[PDB]
């Protein structure tokens, strides 16, 4: 028995949160002898080259960047990279000491795409201003993530991805002051480094950059508080200064001139900000607990230009700070670095289709 309008039977997709070993894809070159290219070639796949996603209309999905097993896997890969790449001269770990050759090697991060294998898929939030924990009402499916450079560093997030609208801040718990505040900029700020032991940053641009962040923070902590930035409260050299790699050498830059501002406190300058920097042969490990010593720098000319696309902050707070909040540079857990890129993704398991009911 039929009537007028042709009834349609739909085969609706069905998936479920899951975990599996993903593979990766890169534009690595088999003729480049730099470590990232060498590693990527040995463990990755050629690229896209015209990526497309399957938008899923009127679908809502819940995410949780702070519990994304994609991060744990990427972390292990970047660790596994440094193991065969940056060979230190000395390795101190657990009452144990090791000595080995330590050849200087070209070292520049190359974008990596993490892809779902046969049977799985990766949901992706298309909502531009998304905090990373909660419902996304604009998801879609992808084969592979975007280009993610394994930039290891603290305080400032380099060569990353900008927010598509306004400055975004993300935290597993804004209330808990022990928790990092991953920040995403909508406009990159160039930091030009040199082996001469300093780093340049446009003063006026970085000034506005802070006003944006400040306004986003003042919004999160009640529209009435004064936002102040201060220098690292102390810790290891890799935390207290803007620690970062640049051409095989580890740089430790003083960042106090960056974070000495006071905002929303209603009561001559320098052309650009110059940061005191210094390479170090003896560094703390980020992989695990321990130290490592490296060989002396090669040539004097060491230039590295990068884009500041993000920040790792921490708040002070306490049962005393009323009418104002204090924020200092931070970081250290390289997973936050990963989560600043893998925040909109989520790997899912695909299973048999389900048919749709009829209501009106």
């Amino acid at each position, epitope marked *: 028995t039929e009537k007028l309008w042709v009834t349609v039977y739909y085969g609706v997709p069905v998936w479920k949160e899951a975990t599996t070993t993903l593979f990766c894809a890169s534009d690595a070159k088999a003729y480049d002898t730099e470590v990232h290219n060498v590693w990527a070639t040995h463990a990755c796949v050629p690229t896209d080259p015209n990526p497309q996603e399957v938008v899923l209309v009127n679908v809502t999905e819940n995410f949780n960047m702070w519990k994304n097993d994609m991060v744990e896997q990427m972390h292990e890969d970047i660790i596994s990279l440094w193991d065969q790449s940056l060979k230190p001269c000395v390795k101190l770990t657990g009452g144990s*000491v090791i000595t080995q050759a330590c050849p200087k090697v070209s070292f520049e991060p190359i974008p990596i795409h993490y892809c779902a294998p046969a049977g799985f898929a990766i949901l992706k939030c298309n909502n531009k201003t998304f905090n990373g924990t909660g419902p996304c009402t604009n998801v879609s499916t992808v084969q592979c993530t975007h280009g993610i450079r394994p930039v290891v560093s603290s305080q400032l997030l380099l060569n990353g991805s900008l927010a598509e609208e306004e400055v975004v801040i993300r935290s597993v718990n804004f209330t808990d002051n022990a928790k990092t505040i991953i920040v995403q900029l909508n406009t990159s700020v160039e930091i030009n480094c040199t082996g001469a032991g300093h780093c340049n940053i446009a003063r006026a641009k970085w000034n506005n950059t802070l006003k944006q962040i400040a306004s986003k923070l003042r919004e999160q902590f009640g529209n009435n508080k004064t936002i102040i930035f201060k220098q690292s409260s102390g810790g290891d050299p890799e935390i207290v200064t803007h620690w970062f790699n640049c051409g095989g050498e580890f740089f430790y830059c003083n960042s106090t001139q960056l974070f000495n501002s006071t905002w929303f406190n209603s009561t001559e300058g320098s052309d650009t900000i110059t940061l005191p920097c210094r390479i170090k042969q003896i560094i703390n490990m980020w992989q695990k607990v321990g*130290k490592a010593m490296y060989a002396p720098p090669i040539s004097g000319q060491i230039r590295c230009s990068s884009n500041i696309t993000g920040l790792l902050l921490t708040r002070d707070g306490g049962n005393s700070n009323n009418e104002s909040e204090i924020f200092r540079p931070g970081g250290g857990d390289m997973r936050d670095n990963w989560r600043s890129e893998l925040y909109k993704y989520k790997v899912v398991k695909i299973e048999p289709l389900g048919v749709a009911p009829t209501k009106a």
Partner: antibody
Amino acid sequence: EVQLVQSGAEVKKPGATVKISCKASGYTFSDFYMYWVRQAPGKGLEWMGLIDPEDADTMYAEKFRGRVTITADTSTDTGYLELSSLRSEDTAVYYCAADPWELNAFNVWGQGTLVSVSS
Amino acid sequence: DIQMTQSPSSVSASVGDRVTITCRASQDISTWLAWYQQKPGKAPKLLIYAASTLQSGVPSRFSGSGSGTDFSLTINSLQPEDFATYYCQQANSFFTFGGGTKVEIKR
């Protein structure tokens, strides 16, 4: 101009703990590593350790780990060196060196500090 | 640690003679080596750094070569004030010294 002026000779009994100094001048003290070397009577040179005064990062030779300690009072431009559980074979001259020109070798040296350890 | 082994332990030579002493690391250390001279009763004197680079104010007849593990210090026209004990030294991280090589006079 540049110089490293150590302390005077010292006599100790086995089991004691000596701590000599090395006041430095002629350059920015806290910007450069400092190294310690000892030389037994009529025997070859023997490195002991180093230190970056800024972060107090230290390194020791295997023959001294967990028995030697190198520090550096940045305010007085002075470096020290401690040796716990002294023995009879620790009798030697102790030099301190530095490299204010960063050639990765010992350019400047101290006059030496004779440490005699016996019963 | 990494071992520095230099030989011979002793070598006798006349003036004007040319002498070669060699060093050898148990593990690759690139060009990070240093040579010292030391006369009895005084502190060592830097001769060569970076394995080949001559220290300022040092006679041109001094020169070292090698890279990686095998190194060598060489004096051309041997002089009266060149008779002493010479040491090599790892300089990339640790600073282990070689056994030592005494260059005494021949008669």
